Structures are given as C-alpha cells and as structure tokens.
C-alpha cells in the first residue's frame, strides 16, 4: 500500500519467529526501539501491529520516534515512547520499470501534524490561501499528494523501499514465540518466565481468587506477587 | 491508493481523428481536474493541455493551436484527448497528471505510447 494509505494487519493467537527475520540478511534496516532484536524469541506480547508501506530510501530515516520529517509528520507518526520495530529493506527491483512507476504515492501538505498511528486518508484540496476555491485547485490551494515516480536508475535516495513497522503493546498474552514450555515446579527457588514475564523465586498453590479476566497479582512496590493460581515468594534470603 | 489507469492506444494511420482516453479512480474527479502531458524519447516532458472543472475553458501551448482537444466527463469520470490531422510526429507518450497550475513533476500516470503510421 502506498504511504498515505499505509495499511496496518493485526497479528495474534500464533507464534511469532523472530530469528529468522533477524538472520536472513536481506532487510537493509532492522532497528528495533525499546526491545534488543535478538531478544524477542523469550518475550511476548497481547498483539503485534504491522503497519506496511513503500518509502524512498532517504526518507527510512524519517521512520522513527521524535523524528521531524515531511513524511514522519503528514504520513505515519510514530510515538514518543513507540515500541516495536522498523524493518526497511530495498524493492528496486520489484518496484522500479522502466518509464517511471507513478505508482507509489504519498501525502504531503496537511493543516496539522498528525497524531502517533494516525492514518490520514482525507482526499481534501489543501488550501494554502485565505480565498477557498471550493474543491476546485487553483491559486493558493493545491492537490496535497505528490508521486515518487520510481525509475530503474534512480540512485539510492531515490531509489524504493518497503517499510514495516512492528508495533507491540503489553496489556494476557496471545502470541508467543518460538521458546519450549517446561513443566511447573513448586516449593524451591527457581527461575520462572510466566508469558514473558521473568522472576526468580518459591512457586506455592495459591488460595486467592482471581477473577476470570485477571492474569497477576500485583501487591505493593509494583512487584509481582502472584500469577496465573500461584503464590511466588522470594526465597530465603537474610545477613550474615 | 488512487489509480490512474489510461486506455493504451494503438497505432493509427493519418487521415482519422485520434480519441485517447484516461480514467482513473479511488478519487472524487468533478472536483479536480486533470492536464493532458506529451513526452518524447530523446527529450523532457513537455505540458500540453489543462481544462477546467467550472468553467472548462481547454487551454493549451501556442504551438498546438488548432490540433488538439480535451472532452471530459464526470458521469464515466474521464478524459477524452481528440486529435485531428494526426502526423508521424506525434509519436508520444500522452500521460495524465492531476490537474494544478503548475503541473510541473505533479503526480502522473504512467502513459500509453501513441505513434501515427504513415
């Protein structure tokens, strides 16, 4: 889809691989804000947003959290504290014919900056002018989109690129990636990874009633207490 | 994703009037109008025709007075390009642009080559 309509898939109840994305080479980005790239096959998430679109080169860079562009600002903002993951990787190839590919198209003026995630689909006639031309562009009020018109010999700047952007949101968990479930042990210190959630101490059966659309129970300092019931408590520990 | 899919045209001998068509889609078009662009091989492209919505007066360069002619409709949403006493010159690449008074590297389509055979 092109950039003023970068369209955005859902992604849950699965396992997601992350290794092989990580390792197939053939992404020329693969930056990854707020989460270590090779970190994500012991974490998970409730969902996974992947918002896809095609870009020029030189503008990747404008795909980021606080980062002022004419794209980043009137196409697809990211928020301050995204995260997720931008994985840009070059379609020139499969992209670029001969003549000029006037496909790609993508927003430019707009009246204010658009809020993070906020896709614009407005086809309205910008108005750069005090007199409205009622729809009708002429002076002072032009058509807001302007074609990328992608040649094979473009250089790298110019040349296409499709961006997904991995967007992750933690609020009980659905799709989990590729890490081995072990069986449970209770009464001895031990490391725990409850759907990504890590700790270490004494597993016990819990006689607290959670509610059915409870996962954890959290108790004072913000510190786990139990989980989906189990009790966790810190084992012994004392001065010497 | 407003997709400006052009009617191809065919080779066509001298003698007959030439009809092109351009439509498009994914876009409200009696609000916006479009221009009529001729580039050649060998040399840039060059701005031929525009028309208004309101008024619809056809306005193009001097040095095509008298040869070509736009007709557009909003019921089908497009453009007719109509050309008369056609010559092998015209061998071209007429493409559609969204309708501005600059129209200078404004979004195109990505055209049909037109060539009169002798």
């Known amino acids: 889809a092109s950039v003023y309509a970068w369209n955005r898939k859902r992604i849950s109840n699965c396992v997601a691989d992350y290794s092989v994305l990580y390792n197939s080479a053939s992404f020329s980005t693969f930056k990854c804000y707020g989460v270590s790239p090779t970190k994500l096959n012991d974490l998970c998430f409730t969902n996974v947003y992947a918002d896809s679109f095609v870009i020029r080169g030189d503008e990747v860079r404008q795909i980021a959290p606080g980062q002022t562009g004419k794209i980043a600002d009137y196409n697809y903002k990211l928020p301050d504290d995204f995260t997720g993951c931008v994985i840009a990787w070059n379609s020139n190839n499969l992209d670029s014919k001969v003549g000029g590919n006037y496909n790609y198209l993508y927003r430019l003026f707009r009246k204010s900056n658009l809020k993070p995630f906020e896709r614009d689909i407005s086809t309205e006639i910008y108005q750069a002018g005090s007199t409205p031309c009622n729809g009708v562009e002429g002076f002072n009020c032009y058509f807001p989109l302007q074609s990328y018109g992608f040649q094979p010999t473009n250089g790298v700047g110019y040349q296409p690129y499709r961006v997904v952007v991995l967007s992750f949101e933690l609020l009980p968990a659905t799709v989990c990636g590729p890490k081995k479930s072990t069986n449970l042990v209770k009464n001895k210190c031990v490391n725990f990874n409850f759907n990504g959630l890590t700790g270490t101490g004494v597993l016990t059966e819990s006689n607290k009633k959670f509610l059915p659309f409870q996962q954890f129970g959290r108790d004072i300092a913000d510190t786990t207490d139990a989980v989906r019931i189990l009790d966790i408590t810190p084992c012994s520990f004392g001065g010497v | 994703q407003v997709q400006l899919v052009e009617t191809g045209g065919g080779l066509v001998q001298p003698g007959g009037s030439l009809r092109l068509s351009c439509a498009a889609s994914?876009?409200?078009?009696?609000?916006?109008?479009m221009n009529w662009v001729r580039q050649a091989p060998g040399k840039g492209p060059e701005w031929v025709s525009r028309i208004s919505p309101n008024s619809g007066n056809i306005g193009y360069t001097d040095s095509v007075k008298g040869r070509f002619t736009i007709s557009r409709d909003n019921a089908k949403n497009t453009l007719y390009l109509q050309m008369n006493n056609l010559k092998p010159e015209d061998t071209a690449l007429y493409y559609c642009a969204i309708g501005l008074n600059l129209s200078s590297s404004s979004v195109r389509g990505q055209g049909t080559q037109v060539t009169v055979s002798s």
């Open positions: 994914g876009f409200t078009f009696s609000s916006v109008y």
